């Protein structure tokens, strides 16, 4: 009962630190997920008309706090942008360990020769668009943001599975549907919410 039994009943891929997200071999540049995320965060704050010289572009609230950089009045817009980014990846192949703040990527282990997303890769890619920086491991994502009782999950909240949220992670879309990068041989998809192995809390990264 600990796990969603439709997926491998093991911890999801755990990709350390701040991986390289962009490589341009012609120009000779590269940048990490955090760099991409900061840059998008600044762009998003600029689009809201609220960019300040003290803004790095990283917009996460301190873990557990209901207050964070993006004003609540702009939270719905931020959430919808995150969801639009995720939804724009419908049909991208699943890859174990795949994905970074810039888009799908080669995975690790199993997924080393496959460009795509895994569960936490898709979530971090989606949220990076508004400056929300997330580690590439579902268990670590579960420790960030603010807990909301799962029975009270709201569109844009993030659903976790397995002990400590280690098995799988998805974005709730409302109306009993969720966006996910599910398993080998599948693609990023909308699917009905599953409650087997679901943690008792969802995570909210954007207040509104």
UniProtKB/Swiss-Prot annotation:
Q: Where in the cell is it found?
A: Secreted
Active site location? 119 (nucleophile), 168 (proton acceptor), 180
Q: Report the residue ranges that make up the NlpC/P60 domain in this protein.
A: 76-208
Q: How is it modified after translation?
A: Exported by the Tat system. The position of the signal peptide cleavage has not been experimentally proven.
Task: Give the top-rank taxon of the lineage listed in the UniProt record for this protein.
Answer: Bacteria
S-S bonds? none
Which spans of this chain does the record mark as coiled coil? none
Q: How does it assemble?
A: Monomer. Interacts with RpfB and PBP1A (ponA1) via residues 448-472 of RipA, interacts with RpfE. Interacts with the chaperone MoxR1. RipA-MoxR1 interaction in the cytoplasm leads to proper folding of RipA, resulting in its secretion. Also interacts with Mce2B.
Q: Which family does it belong to?
A: Belongs to the peptidase C40 family.
Q: What does the further note read? A: Was identified as a high-confidence drug target.
What this chain does, per the entry, is described as: Peptidoglycan endopeptidase that cleaves the bond between D-glutamate and meso-diaminopimelate. Binds and degrades high-molecular weight peptidoglycan from a number of Actinobacteria; activity is increased in the presence of RpfB and inhibited by PBP1A (ponA1). Required for normal separation of daughter cells after cell division and for cell wall integrity. Required for host cell invasion and intracellular survival in host macrophages.
What is the name of this protein?
Peptidoglycan endopeptidase RipA
Organism of this sequence:
Mycobacterium tuberculosis (strain ATCC 25618 / H37Rv)
Q: Please indicate which part of the intact protein appears here, giving the first and last residue numbers and the full length.
A: 265 to 472 of 472
């Amino acid at each position: 009962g600990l796990w969603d039994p439709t997926l491998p009943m093991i911890p999801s891929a755990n990709i350390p630190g701040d991986p390289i997200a962009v490589v341009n071999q012609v120009l000779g540049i590269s940048a990490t997920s955090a760099q991409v995320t900061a840059n998008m965060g600044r762009k998003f704050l600029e689009q809201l008309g609220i960019l300040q010289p003290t803004d790095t572009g990283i917009t996460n609230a301190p873990a557990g706090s209901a207050q964070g950089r993006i004003p609540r009045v702009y939270g719905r817009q931020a959430s919808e942008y995150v969801i639009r980014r995720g939804m724009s990846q419908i049909g991208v192949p699943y890859s174990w360990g795949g994905g970074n703040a810039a888009g799908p990527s080669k995975g690790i282990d199993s997924g080393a020769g496959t460009v795509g997303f895994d569960c936490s890769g898709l979530v971090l890619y989606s949220f990076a668009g508004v400056g929300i920086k997330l580690p590439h491991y579902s268990g670590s994502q579960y420790n960030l943001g603010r807990k909301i009782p799962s029975s009270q999950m709201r569109r844009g909240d993030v659903i976790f599975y397995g002990p400590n949220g280690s098995q799988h992670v998805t974005i709730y879309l409302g109306n009993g549907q969720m966006l996910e990068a599910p398993d080998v041989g599948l693609k990023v998809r909308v699917a009905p919410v599953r409650t087997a192995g679901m943690t008792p809390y969802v995570v909210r990264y954007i207040e509104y």
